[PDB]
Symmetry: D2
Subunit: 334 residues, 4 copies
């Protein structure tokens, strides 16, 4: 049905979309890219990656294009999605990764410029928001603009889904200890209105708001309004970890929690398990959206009260991208 | 006032001297034991990667440091029973090596001639003090005492206020904690803790801590009610403790915050902030703990409520100010 | 009856420390206005809390259009074009231009159009009068209206080069500065104008970086004009940097003889310090010198008559440089 | 000789095995000596903070690792003379501890039953090989040999190329070098190197290296003609070496670049780039050195000329590829 993709925002996520497509020998082809710079610079960045090393395929450029593994890809530099000649090269599905079109409204522009669907790499208000292998069954043939939420949502949802199915989550709160991202600052200085995002990212633990828990309802309707949470951004370049403290509907042991999660992760391409004593750098390059860590499970019980802490690692860049692509391969065949 | 000897002139031990001089303490530090030469200890005291130049002059001789013109004997005895504490009359040993964290181990300082030992770490079931939480339990018969971990000193005042105002039924803690000398610079063996083998400045590293588990030593009413752990991360000092609690009363954020504010009023140990601070803003703190009203979160569904409360701490200097407050009291008893 | 009222344009790393240092030295200069691109609330937050130097040592509060610092009111404007900044409202006479966007006489004379009398630019700014304090500040006079203090790297390099050239002659030389990362770099890998290297994650890489410190040294030491080149390697430290110079000197030397010459050049010299301690970059953070010559790193490599001389100086590229900018400013205001 | 033992299963020792498996060497690693348990060595081999997951299966028993299905004996003898190398017939020891960097010290492996030792570091006046610079000097009667430092492996190919084309009359080197396990995580004693005592991820740290001073072992004509030092900085691996030379001939940058381009043609050890790379781009390199044409700088005044040339190196994996090339050759003489 659909096999031709445009990327808007050839950034950390945008470039990795291309990387992953090619790694899996997908039959979707990226045919156009829009950003704000030259093909020379986009090529430079695609070839040389500080988190994942040299691109595995040949890369070259001309004044209006990239050439990747011998195939040509048009490069545009339109600040406004309207102006992208998606039509020209035949781009059916826009992977929207700029951070500036996070609305059904705004991503409309891509359809105006002639693409048939848009997948947004971020939370985008009230729309179909898919975590692959949690709720991608809610996607139908009539969907045109869908969100794959945040990396944190891809981490939290599968862990929350398994606990809720096995035990029931009554209420919970999350904290993600999260790699710093391009929304933060290199040195202390203004970064819009958010005071904390103004601070040097590689030199600080920085509290930071996230909607992963607040909006979990879109992905797991039964948990709607039952979770809150935030982040602490810390000085690692990628690789993050989400802790969820829940009140569950049954009394449990750690062994029981971990066996329920082991079952949910078995033959599960999206959601991995470990009982090894890994650290964040071990998750870099993960092909899961989320890796449940059984070594960090903790049950605090005082009589009838019980707090359950469960922890899952995630490569907020590559890991999340593997989910984005799963959802895209599916969305393209409807 | 009392003469002190410091065993282990490391991150903590050096900052103990710094803080004593800074507050113009009546304690005199007369001796230091470590594993190295006066020249290396002089170099490390003068030049600090986290706190900058030492604020006083530092020199060394073959067997001493000269700090602000005052002589401090230097010994290099790896067994504490061999340290000649009597030679300069060191009465109270500030035990900062990590290698004597029990009554039975620190007894070796009493054997070597000291009267009392204050241990800069958890040390099993001994009197364990967080200043301005339970320092009123000290008395003139105590000879070996612990000030627990920096995390305990962060946790305890926040837990005490919550418990006193609302009751804590159960809770769990995670501290996002600066890396420390127990970890590894490059991936390599670090005893039996597998995760401690990993490169500390390049990883988020889960790490076990007893701060919550043994909180009953400091706040007896909370024995068995808390658990927790740490995530060690690449900042050089400056840490933050989150506690998620079920309290005995339904609350709003403002109510929690006001109660904490009252607990920090005229409290030289426990500060308050409603500013959007980050960990480097806690470096050099003179509190053991600073509650952060900006991160308070109430998650409520029917009659169920989870309360998240967060406090910052400088696990080096901030904790040290607590250690020093405890030392000054312990010395006058 | 000297100029005493300052405006700061660009209340950034450098601009905020300009205020800090002025208060710290109890300058008779008052900062009466700040221009940047944001709210007083944000500026007050950034001034109070600093990731590199810790809590501001004086009280900080703000209103809808001002900061109140140590009880003194300072106007805040948000004009992206310098020509629009209302410097006359509080009588700002000298502008300390710290934005990075007005690094030429042609650009910075906008402040004059906007009612200021003089401008001191916290950066190289082409071929205008350029001062490294205690190297060539004697060249400033009453007719100088727009002046540059060059880069932190020039303030590190110049006093060392000057001492060497005066004592032995420098016939030719090349510099490399191992330099803390700065806000011209990138947090994550992504476009950063046209410099490909500046696009790379600054806290995760050693990044070669072009600098004019050596190339334009003739503005400060005219006898070395065109005799030096160099570059930077940007590395993951937040502040604190070090400059190595490899020279061919006009004389055969020993390390001790170079060290002693430098030691004499640093005696009673508030701008240029000396060390023979085994210091590392965090020990220079908050330095009150523009440059600290490190005798422990001096190296003479000689084969017959061919001799190469390596000299190394530390610098706190933020605060240490700022101390130099402030010395130059105090003198500028009294000419 | 196809059976090898590894003394010191650290950053270099583990990558030695990783690379041997990666190139499908016929070398058989039969034994490893270190200071710890198989469990711990297994965890370290499996999880690498710089290079990611080990590409082969790893298990262990109480006295062995099993790597890609093959058993490797693990010993824990802190003195090399006691390591039982004859048990599994380890003939060539790859000496990677840092504790045996001299003929006299590494002799202990031979007293312990091995036939040859290749030392992963400089080791005084003994045969010292940078592959594809002077590996032809390896001789069938050599039994103790060095591959010098990573810095040497970076410097030597560049210096050889320049010397062969233009003559190097005198030169000085500075390497901007990733931090290593000889440094400290937090400020604390580290033998007698004061600079080594400082927190490695939080400082620029000047550091002594023999790479230039001992270059005469590799390129005898350059003996005594180079000096240099390092600045250790906060990157986990990946380094850069700058050489400032007076050459024998007047040159342009294009001419230097062209000559270096030629030395790197069909040279598996010495690579070339004219892309604007940064240090993380060298991580995982299969070269000992990658000359970077983009940083070549000629400074000329009248008749005088200074030539600055620069090459990148993965001080871990890149150097290891050189160690393996040398090992393969050494095994067959
Ligand atoms: N980095 C992560 O961990 C992560 C994880 C999950 C989701 N996301 C989301 O994915 C999106 C991208 O994040 P990223 O980290 O890749 O950001 P990034 O800053 O690395 O990349 C954004 C790219 O978009 C470009 N850009 C900005 N405005 C543009 C415009 N108007 N038109 C075209 N290009 C424009 C920039 O040039 C840049 O190349 C964001 O919405 C983010 O929330 C990020
Ligand atoms: N964040 C912190 O660093 C922190 C906070 C609170 C408590 N503590 C505790 O304080 C203690 C010291 O911590 P640190 O971070 O200063 O460690 P450190 O490693 O920086 O200091 C330890 C010092 O003890 C010396 N030493 C080791 N064994 C010795 C012996 N047998 N005899 C004499 N000297 C010896 C070492 O040479 C070193 O100088 C530990 O118990 C630690 O848990 C540390
Ligand atoms: N950081 C260093 O090591 C260093 C040392 C010496 C000199 N310098 C020079 O000092 C200058 C400032 O450097 P910095 O590191 O403080 O940069 P910075 O980015 O921290 O500060 C720039 C400030 O100017 C503001 N700004 C930008 N454009 C503006 C405009 N049109 N009008 C008003 N305000 C504007 C920004 O909002 C920010 O507050 C640059 O020229 C730089 O090269 C920097
Ligand atoms: N890391 C680099 O960049 C680099 C590059 C080239 C050469 N080298 C050199 O290679 C050697 C090892 O460096 P590394 O970075 O792997 O160091 P490392 O500290 O990572 O590893 C050393 C290993 O030896 C073990 N060890 C220590 N003493 C021992 C003993 N007496 N017997 C047995 N095992 C012992 C340790 O447990 C550790 O596993 C050194 O000589 C170093 O100079 C290092
Ligand atoms: Cl986040
Ligand atoms: Cl901890
Ligand atoms: Cl203007
Ligand atoms: Cl620079
Ligand atoms: Cl080195």
């Amino acid at each position: 049905s659909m096999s031709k993709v445009g990327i808007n925002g050839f950034g950390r996520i945008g470039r990795l979309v291309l990387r992953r497509l090619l790694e899996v020998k997908s039959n979707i082809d990226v045919v156009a890219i829009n950003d704000l710079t030259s093909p020379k610079i986009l090529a430079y960045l695609l070839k040389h990656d500080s988190n994942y090393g040299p691109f595995p395929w040949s890369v070259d450029f001309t004044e209006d294009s990239l050439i990747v593994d011998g195939k040509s890809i048009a490069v545009y530099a339109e600040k406004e999605a309207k102006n992208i000649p998606w039509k020209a090269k035949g781009a059916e599905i826009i992977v929207e990764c700029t951070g500036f079109y996070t609305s059904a409204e705004k991503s409309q522009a891509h359809l105006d410029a002639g693409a048939k669907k848009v997948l947004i790499s971020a939370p985008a208000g009230e729309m179909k928001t898919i975590v692959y292998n949690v709720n991608d069954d809610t996607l139908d043939g009539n969907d045109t603009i869908v969100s794959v939420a945040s990396s944190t949502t891809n981490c939290l949802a599968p862990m929350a889904k398994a606990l809720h199915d096995s035990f029931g989550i009554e209420v919970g709160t999350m904290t993600t200890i999260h790699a710093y991202t391009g929304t933060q600052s290199l040195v202390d200085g203004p970064r819009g209105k958010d005071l904390r995002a103004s601070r040097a990212a590689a030199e600080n633990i920085i509290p930071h708001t996230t909607g992963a828990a607040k909006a979990i309802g879109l992905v797991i309707p039964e948990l709607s309004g039952k979770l809150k949470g935030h982040a602490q951004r810390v000085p690692v370049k990628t690789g993050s970890v989400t802790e969820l403290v829940s009140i569950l509907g049954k009394k449990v042991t750690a062994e029981e929690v971990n066996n329920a999660l082991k079952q949910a992760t078995t033959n599960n391409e999206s959601f991995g398990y470990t009982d090894e004593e890994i650290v964040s750098s071990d998750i870099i390059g993960s092909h899961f959206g989320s890796v449940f860590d059984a070594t960090q499970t903790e049950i605090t019980a005082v009589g009838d009260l019980q707090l359950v802490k469960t922890v899952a690692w995630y490569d907020n860049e590559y890991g999340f991208v593997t989910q984005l692509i799963r959802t895209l391969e599916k969305f393209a065949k409807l």
